[PDB]
Design a protein around this ligand. Structure first.
Ligand SMILES: *[C@@H]1O[C@H](CO)[C@@H](O[C@@H]2O[C@H](CO)[C@@H](O)[C@H](O)[C@H]2NC(C)=O)[C@H](O)[C@H]1NC(C)=O
Ligand SMILES: *[C@@H]1O[C@H](CO)[C@@H](O[C@@H]2O[C@H](CO)[C@@H](O)[C@H](O)[C@H]2NC(C)=O)[C@H](O)[C@H]1NC(C)=O
Ligand SMILES: *[C@@H]1O[C@H](CO)[C@@H](O[C@@H]2O[C@H](CO)[C@@H](O)[C@H](O)[C@H]2NC(C)=O)[C@H](O)[C@H]1NC(C)=O
Ligand SMILES: *[C@@H]1O[C@H](CO)[C@@H](O[C@@H]2O[C@H](CO)[C@@H](O)[C@H](O)[C@H]2NC(C)=O)[C@H](O)[C@H]1NC(C)=O
Ligand SMILES: *[C@@H]1O[C@H](CO)[C@@H](O)[C@H](O)[C@H]1NC(C)=O
Ligand SMILES: *[C@@H]1O[C@H](CO)[C@@H](O)[C@H](O)[C@H]1NC(C)=O
Lengths: 49, 205
C-alpha cells in the first residue's frame, strides 16, 4: 500500500524507465489510474503496475 | 504586419506524463493557422485571453516583459526581466518609463515577489492567479516568418501572482511576433518518450 503526497493505492512499485520531464509528478492510464509516480524526496520515477 | 502561425504554439497542458497516447485536451491555445502580428518606437499590447510571444534574434536586444492593468504604479504589475547574471521576476508597483529598456522604471511603491534563476517561443497564461510561462528555443533558417513544423513549449515557471493583467509590453535595450490564445479542443500525439509530436486543432476545419 502507498500514500504519495495523497496519491493512494496498492501496487508493485518498480524502478521506472519512463522519462518524466522535470515538472511532471504523475503518469496516467487510459482509465486515469496513476501509472507511474515521482518519489517526493528522491525525485526518482516509479511504475505502479 | 501579419503572418501565419503555421501550427506553432502548442504546449504541455497537464503535469501528467502520458506516452504513446492520443489525448483530447480543452485549453487556451493559439488556434492553428492563426493570423499573428509581426513587428518589422515601442507598443503597448493587449493581453487578451493569453499571449504567445516569440523573437528570432540571439543578440539579447529583447530583455523582458511587463504586464498589468496600468503599467504606472497606481497598481501592481508583473515584471519579467533578464540580466547578465540572472533570470529575474518580480511583482512590484513600478513607475515604468514611457520606453522601458535596461532604466525600465523611475521608482517603485510596493512589492510581493522576487523570483530568480534561434527562435524563442513563449506562452503566458493567467488562470486562478497563476501566471504560467512555457517556452522552447528552436532553430530557424528565416527571420521574416515563423518556421514550418511542430514544436511543443515546456513549462518554464509557474507563479501564484494573483494580480489582474490586461495590457503588456516588451523590454528592449540600448523582430518579434505576437499572437493571442482562444479556448480550443486539441488532440495531442504524445510519442513513446511522452513528448507532443503532432496535434489537431479540432475546430479548424
Ligand atoms: C481588471 O482590470 C480592468 C482594467 O484594465 C478592470 O476593468 C474596469 O472595471 C471597472 C469596474 O471594476 C470599470 O468601471 C471599468 O470601466 C473597467 N475598465 C475597462 C477598460 O473595461 C477589471 O474590472 C479588472 N478585473 C478584475 C477581476 O479585477
Ligand atoms: C540581476 O538582478 C538581480 C536581482 O534580481 C541582482 O541580484 C542582486 O545582486 C546584489 C549585488 O549586486 C545582491 O546583494 C542581491 O542579494 C542580489 N539579489 C538577488 C535576489 O539575487 C543581480 O545583481 C543583477 N545582475 C546584474 C548583472 O545586473
Ligand atoms: C502599498 O499598497 C497599498 C495598497 O495595496 C497602499 O495602501 C493605501 O495607502 C493609502 C495612503 O498612501 C491609503 O489611503 C489607502 O487606504 C491604502 N489602501 C489600502 C487598501 O489599505 C500602501 O500605501 C502602498 N505603500 C506605499 C509605501 O505607498
Ligand atoms: C526516444 O528516446 C530515445 C533515447 O532514449 C531516442 O533514441 C536515441 O536517438 C538519438 C538521436 O536523437 C540517438 O543518438 C540515440 O542513439 C538513440 N538511442 C537509442 C537507444 O536508439 C528515440 O529516438 C526517441 N524516440 C522518438 C520517437 O523520438
Ligand atoms: C529532503 O530529504 C532528502 C533526503 O531524502 C535530502 O537530500 C534533501 O536535502 C531534503 N530536502 C531539503 C530541502 O533539504
Ligand atoms: C490578418 O488579419 C488582419 C486583421 O486582423 C487582416 O487585415 C488580414 O487581411 C488578415 N490576413 C489574412 C491572410 O487573412
Amino acid at each position: 500500500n502507498f500514500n504519495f503526497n495523497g496519491l493512494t493505492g496498492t501496487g508493485v512499485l518498480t524502478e521506472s524507465n519512463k522519462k518524466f520531464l522535470p515538472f511532471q509528478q504523475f503518469g496516467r492510464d487510459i482509465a486515469d489510474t496513476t501509472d507511474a509516480v515521482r518519489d517526493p524526496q528522491t525525485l526518482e520515477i516509479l511504475d505502479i503496475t | 504586419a501579419y503572418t501565419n502561425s503555421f501550427t506553432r504554439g502548442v504546449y504541455y497542458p497537464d503535469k501528467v506524463f502520458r506516452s504513446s497516447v492520443l489525448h483530447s485536451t480543452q485549453d487556451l491555445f493559439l488556434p492553428f493557422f492563426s493570423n499573428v502580428t509581426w513587428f518589422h518606437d515601442n507598443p503597448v499590447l493587449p493581453f487578451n485571453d493569453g499571449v504567445y510571444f516569440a523573437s528570432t534574434e540571439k543578440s539579447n536586444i529583447i530583455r523582458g516583459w511587463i504586464f498589468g492593468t496600468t503599467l504606472d504604479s497606481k497598481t501592481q504589475s508583473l515584471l519579467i526581466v533578464n540580466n547578465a547574471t540572472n533570470v529575474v521576476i518580480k511583482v512590484c508597483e513600478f513607475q515604468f518609463c514611457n520606453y522601458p529598456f535596461l532604466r525600465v522604471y523611475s521608482s517603485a511603491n510596493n512589492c510581493t515577489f522576487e523570483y530568480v534563476s534561434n527562435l524563442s517561443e513563449f506562452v503566458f497564461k493567467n488562470i486562478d492567479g497563476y501566471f504560467k510561462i512555457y517556452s522552447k528555443h528552436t532553430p530557424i533558417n528565416l527571420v521574416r516568418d515563423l518556421p514550418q513544423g511542430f514544436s511543443a513549449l515546456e513549462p518554464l515557471v509557474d507563479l501564484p501572482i494573483g494580480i489582474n493583467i490586461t495590457r503588456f509590453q516588451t523590454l528592449l535595450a540600448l523582430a518579434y511576433y505576437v499572437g493571442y490564445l482562444q479556448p480550443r479542443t486539441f488532440l495531442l500525439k504524445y510519442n513513446e518518450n511522452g513528448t507532443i509530436t503532432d496535434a489537431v486543432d479540432c475546430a479548424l476545419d
